[PDB]
Amino acid sequence: AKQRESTDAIFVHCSATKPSQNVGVREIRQWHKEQGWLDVGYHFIIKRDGTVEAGRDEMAVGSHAKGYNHNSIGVCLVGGIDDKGKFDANFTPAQMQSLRSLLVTLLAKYEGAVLRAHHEVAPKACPSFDLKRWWEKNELVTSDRG
Ligand SMILES: [Zn+2]
Numbered sequence: 001a002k003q004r005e006s007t008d009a010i011f012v013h014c015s016a017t018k019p020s021q022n023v024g025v026r027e028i029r030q031w032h033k034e035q036g037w038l039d040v041g042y043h044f045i046i047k048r049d050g051t052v053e054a055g056r057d058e059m060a061v062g063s064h065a066k067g068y069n070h071n072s073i074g075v076c077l078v079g080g081i082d083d084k085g086k087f088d089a090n091f092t093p094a095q096m097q098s099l100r101s102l103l104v105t106l107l108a109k110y111e112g113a114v115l116r117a118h119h120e121v122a123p124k125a126c127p128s129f130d131l132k133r134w135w136e137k138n139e140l141v142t143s144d145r146g
Pocket of ligand 1: 012013014064118124126127
């Protein structure tokens with residue numbers, strides 16, 4: 001098992017859970033290991049009250065964006081779908097506030113890293129919001145692109 005060579009990107013994801021699912025790394029680590037992986041695939045989880053919990057070691061290869069696990073940080077927001085199972089940007093004010101300082105901290109310490117939304121690189125709606133519009137205007141809108 002080993003550490004990454006470089007950190008070209010910080011990817012943002014959601015856990016694809018509903019509002020009522022107040023979960024964190026204890027549960028998502030358990031869910032990922034029942035699916036056959038060795039640990040939680042994300043380096044950071046932001047719970048719905050804004051608590052950021054650490055997953056994999058900040059410097060290790062994780063499993064969150066395939067073909068990119070070798071050179072990136074994966075950050076996960078708890079939420080992402082409504083009760084119908086559709087993608088929905090239902091993240092809390094407090095989650096978005098913690099996310100924005102974690103990312104300013106991360107972009108600063110990983111010289112040259114770029115900030116990315118999983119849906120830019122894979123056919124998925126994850127993280128369920130338009131990353132550029134929230135990073136720039138502080139507007140949260142439900143989206144499969146951006
Ligand atoms: Zn994702």
